[PDB]
Amino acid sequence: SDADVQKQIKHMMAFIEQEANEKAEEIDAKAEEEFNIEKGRLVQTQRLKIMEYY
Amino acid sequence: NIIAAKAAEVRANKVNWQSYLQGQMISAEDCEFIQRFEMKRCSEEKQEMLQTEGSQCAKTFINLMTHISKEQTVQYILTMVDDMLQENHQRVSIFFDYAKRSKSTAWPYFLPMLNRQDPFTVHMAARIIAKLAAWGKELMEGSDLNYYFNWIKTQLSSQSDSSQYVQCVAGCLQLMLRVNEYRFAWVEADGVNCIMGVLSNKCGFQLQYQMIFSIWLLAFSPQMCEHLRRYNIIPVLSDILQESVKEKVTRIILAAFRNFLEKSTERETRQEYALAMIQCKVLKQLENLEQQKYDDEDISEDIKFLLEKLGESVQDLSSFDEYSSELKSGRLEWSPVHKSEKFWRENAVRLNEKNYELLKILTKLLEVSDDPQVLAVAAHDVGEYVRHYPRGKRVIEQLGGKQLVMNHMHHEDQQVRYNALLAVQKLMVHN
Amino acid sequence: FVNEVRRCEEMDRKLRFVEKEIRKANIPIMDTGENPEVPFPRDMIDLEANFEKIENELKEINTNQEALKRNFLELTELKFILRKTQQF
Amino acid sequence: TVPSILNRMQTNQTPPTYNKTNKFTHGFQNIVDAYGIGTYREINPAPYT
Incomplete structure (x- = not known):
């Protein structure tokens, strides 16, 4: 039946859009760690000058 | 898959909260709040209500999940909370504020739900817990963290609706592992060895990717890269990378391998990983993967990165000092140096150093050793020495080593016989 | 599927090469039974490594057989030369 | 798990x-085909040959 093929069409459509979320979670995991690293570097850069000043 | 299908059925299977109020299972304030919440449907309507009524919001959902035994009702409440946090994760702060007002962590409200008999109810608890504990500033810790991990490990060890439930478990772990502290605590959990076991049992490709994404998160942190060596990751993931076809699995393994060689605390730990990769034929696989082509060039960049870092490891391994050290240590165990054509082609004359000391070792190992690997490798090395330094034939004859390989061509192990045959054949190839 | 077919094209040439060596040697090809295809999993790489193993062993062992035989023949001539020249 | 099922086409x-053939019929189909291949659904x- 074409309806049972259409259930597979709906599954494959949901599957690729779920895969986009899974790639977005890879992107999120990369970006949040790198964000914390860059924030940490920028903090430590001025914090070191502040420690030397005091 | 199963939890999304069961959630869609549960979203249709709504219930009359006034019946639980009449049955004294809930307060009038809980019933009136949940009935208003079913009618608040714009984001602004939900925001006004939740921002105005946050203590009663947490109290309502906590009471209606905790005290009610009727599965379809608790399933619905868990579905509404999972949807509420999926619509905006900042709502975790309402449950945490109510826990702080109650002089408690949030975990004791949700952890009891993992003890229910229904798979959807316990996995929806795990989903909400993963969101709550990962998006929260409050840390899941000690016994509460161990209960969640032990529930995960229990479901993992069971390995189909059962497999689709475990896919939700893997997703619940992936969300939790967004937090660095929870990842390091998971390295301290032997559940990493359970994951290696499930991969070795050749679970579905969906679980392979979801698990290896969790491994890739661990592989990002230098501290964990040093600690996790014990779990034999590269062998397992290299088997999956060689055997499995899927681009998703391929990408996330190459990303894990890149993270290991980028992030490791030591050049020695990078060399340990790169050596294990080369031994696990990863370089040969990477070369095939370079000829394969993809819809995501990050795969190709990770291949090039790994091929370069493994190329440096081959250059390090191709040192005559490392070769000398391995001979002096007797470690003739198919270290990739032995098969380095570049090494032999460009360096075989060096074995004449210190009055032929390395050849004296090779022949002495062919005299003394029982180990067929040491024997086969020492014969291979004699063969390559002759192959790239033909004047060496007379030196091996002066050491008597021709007779040792001529004995070992009849050794009980074909690996010895073969390499000993090659070596004696090169010794005998011309005057 | 450039690579996958190209691998098959070369593995077929490797089959033809080892088969020609076997047929020149008149070693009997057994030709027994009938068989399924390879798995979809990457096991064709282990098969490709087996093709390379046989080919490399033939090229090496043939060259050695020739060289060793030639040396033995030259040394036989030299044995007779030395025995006859010993009259001087 | 995907059964890879088809749809029947209409815009064809x-x-x-x-034609299916066997020992007593294959050569007869071949000598017919050798002049030309019948139109779809054609007699x-x-x-008869």
């Missing part, structure tokens, strides 16, 4: 022509 060009010379 004329398909290739097939087959081969059984």
